[PDB]
Amino acid sequence: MVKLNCRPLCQAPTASRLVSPPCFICRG
Amino acid sequence: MVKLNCRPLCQAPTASRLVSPPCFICRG
Amino acid sequence: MNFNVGVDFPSFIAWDGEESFPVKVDGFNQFGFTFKTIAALTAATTFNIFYHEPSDADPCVPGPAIRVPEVPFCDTVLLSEDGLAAVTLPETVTPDSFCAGTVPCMNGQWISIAPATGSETNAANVQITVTMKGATR
Amino acid sequence: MNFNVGVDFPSFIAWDGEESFPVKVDGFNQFGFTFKTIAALTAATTFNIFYHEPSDADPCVPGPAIRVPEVPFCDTVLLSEDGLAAVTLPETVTPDSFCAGTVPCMNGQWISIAPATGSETNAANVQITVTMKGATR
Amino acid sequence: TYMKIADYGQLGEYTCDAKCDAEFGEPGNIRHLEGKTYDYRGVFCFNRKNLQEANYDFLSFMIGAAQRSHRINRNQALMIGKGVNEPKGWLTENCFPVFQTLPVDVNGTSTPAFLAQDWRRFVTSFPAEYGEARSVMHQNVFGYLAAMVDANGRFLFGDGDLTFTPDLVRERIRISNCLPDPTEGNTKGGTGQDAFAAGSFVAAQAAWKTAFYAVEKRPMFFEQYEGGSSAWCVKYQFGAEDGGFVGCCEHGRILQI
Amino acid sequence: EANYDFLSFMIGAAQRSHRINRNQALMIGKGVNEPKGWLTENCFPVFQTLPVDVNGTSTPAFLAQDWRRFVTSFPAEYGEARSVMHQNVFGYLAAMVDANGRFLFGDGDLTFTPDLVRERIRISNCLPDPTEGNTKGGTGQDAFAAGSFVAAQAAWKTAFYAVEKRPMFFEQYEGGSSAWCVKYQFGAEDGGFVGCCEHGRILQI
Amino acid sequence: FFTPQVLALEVDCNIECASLLDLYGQIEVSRSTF
């Protein structure tokens, strides 16, 4: 049939939000 | 002459609240 | 790759909650018991064991229901006041827990279990069947 | 000297003649069906096989009844409709002479058997049980 | 198949003295068990024309793909695979003791948190009578542990060198990336909407040398599947088979939320 | 004909029941035809904790400060007094936090593992765990039980004594053992008592 | 009809207590009373 390869170009970027432990709030 | 050895089917969750020493408030 | 584990160890309905069924064990040499609950129990339940002989009218149908006598092992601490074999399921058996049992002394050709009187309402929520082991023919 | 084969090959009620019952197999690795006739039938009786999955509400309660598919093999040249796993006990079947079977490919958590459309009235006089083997848990 | 010692019932209690006789205690069990293996095979077809007059080789690429896919699929099934036609994954049986942490409220919102209190409590809540038992988790959650801060602002681990470098392993920590890494990427520890997720697996800690086993019988085999080849195609066939199973899910504990 | 061997299995089970029953009796034995358990002896110096308050709702609580006070409050002239407690208590202690966020013990090591021999502390996982099992009953609210055995400490070389007379003996019961049956019998000889319940403290809630 | 063959062997998964015996005083009486 037709393998139909694409290879997009735009490549538009990523947005990892690199979160990290918040401040220690008392339990209860 | 019962001799009724037995077992159940699949067991069930084990979620024990992992409570932990809270913040030291103040004796006073 | 489950083998056809029905051609040997064939199971048969013994007590479907409200009806017993005599089962022939002559073709076999060993047979156990399998108990199951379908709902929550209220009190402990009791069952009496019966056996049947070839009826004189037909050599391949069960006869009457003769009570099975209990045979004591060693280290026995209690014997039924009648001396007849019987079983009982204790209270607090959740209906997801199979139960096993076996009488070590057989007699007759057919076996049967019946809910002992007074403990038959809960028997509705109880199912009993039996498998075998031998070929012998 | 019949060993207690309740444990080590237990069994359960699969089809009493009035309604089906899910029988868990996940705790085991081998299993099979044993059929038995309370009397002679009128025509060939066919049965559909179903398997289930643990309900999202609880991992130990029967969910929907998924239709297990038929799986052929080397000498299977009679592929039926939509490749569903279904069996059929023929006529000329008597009591005191049982039949057995099992599904070659397993999937799901517990199995169930239902009277395929057209055999219900006749299936009302058949008893189906399941025997397991190789429990690992 | 193999035996499984269930328990050792009580035999002798502490008796009185007006008894020349004695007392019978009930015995335990031997609880025999069985188990099986599982298969893994497949095929592919090439076009002899494409294969021969090509830019370069494709076959060895496919063989390496076979080996790597086999290894990674075996590992992932060993982790999470179901019992149906596969070895049962120890993570899915839900009979290992799995705990979860209370959600710290944030002025009105009880919110998921892998508070260092919970981790230190878990690692020290394990019967040492079972011997040592190693823990496993994802690298992302480990780095999350390394980044925990106090109410002041100081680091909670290695304050003053900007790198925690905690000398792992030497204390029970074996980092893998096959685990479901409760930090989605590195975006799940968000006290705000980014909260780590209702009931998500965090880490594990077990004595694996007796908690789980893997049985190995058949290595990889590759045959030229004659009968599918048509002098215009070629079809190879391969296979390998093995299995795995939990030993006893009481030699290891699991974390969740 | 058995596939397994019941004999050695029964022997091991009997020795195990011997050991575990001896320990459980020596600890909580109810006097009659058995050594009186020094836990139930109930003359041993004991001290409760303080009704710590939070949200103007007092709750039984317990701090490392109270623990150190209980440890150092011993009459040292009595001699060295080993302390004992469940492992879950050790977990509770190694997981104490200040008002800032720092660990009260081993700050910045992910654990707290000293050698519990110079620390004069020992663990028995069946010593009644003060926590209702680990964690579940632990602290704060809906947890942390009340008037419960937290820990013990004593000069056990003079606080409690154990007497040993005869080890385990096993023999085939000749009487009653026919050619169709067979029966075995066994026994031992042990006991214990409390020396003087003035050599050790108890920490309770 | 096939024969499953033996393997594994000795999953036990059973625990005990500690040993709070050496701390107590040891006495070895020969008779039954003291």
Residue numbers in the entry:
A (entry chain AP), B (entry chain AQ): 1 to 28
C (entry chain AK), D (entry chain AL): 1 to 137
E (entry chain AJ): 208 to 464
F (entry chain AA): 260 to 464
G (entry chain AA): 174 to 207
Article sentences:
The Milano capsid has a T = 9 icosahedral symmetry. It consists of three structural elements that are formed by the MCP (gp9): a pentamer at the icosahedral 5-fold axis, hexamer 1 at the icosahedral 3-fold, and hexamer 2 positioned on a local 2-fold. The icosahedral asymmetric unit is formed by a single subunit of the pentamer, two subunits of hexamer 1, and a complete hexamer 2. Hexamer 1 and hexamer 2 differ in their decorating proteins. The Milano MCP has a HK97-like fold found in all MCPs of dsDNA tailed phages. The conformational plasticity in the P domains, E loops, and N arms of the MCP enable the stable construction of quasi-equivalent pentamers and hexamers. Hexamers and pentamers are further decorated by additional proteins: mCP (gp10) and two linking proteins (LP)—LP1 (gp16) and LP2 (gp128). A dimer of mCP decorates the external surface of the capsid by cementing the pentamer-hexamer 1 and hexamer 1-hexamer 2 interfaces, where it forms disulfide bonds with the MCPs (gp9Cys223—gp10Cys105 and gp9Cys252—gp10Cys74). The resolved parts of LPs—residues 1-13 of LP1 and 1-10 of LP2—occupy quasi-equivalent positions with an mCP at the periphery of pentamer and hexamers and run towards the centers of the pentamers and hexamers, where they interact with the MCPs. Finely, we note that the MCP and mCP are doubly linked: (1) by direct disulfide bonds between MCP and mCP, and (2) through linking proteins LP1 and LP2, which are bound to both MCP and mCP.
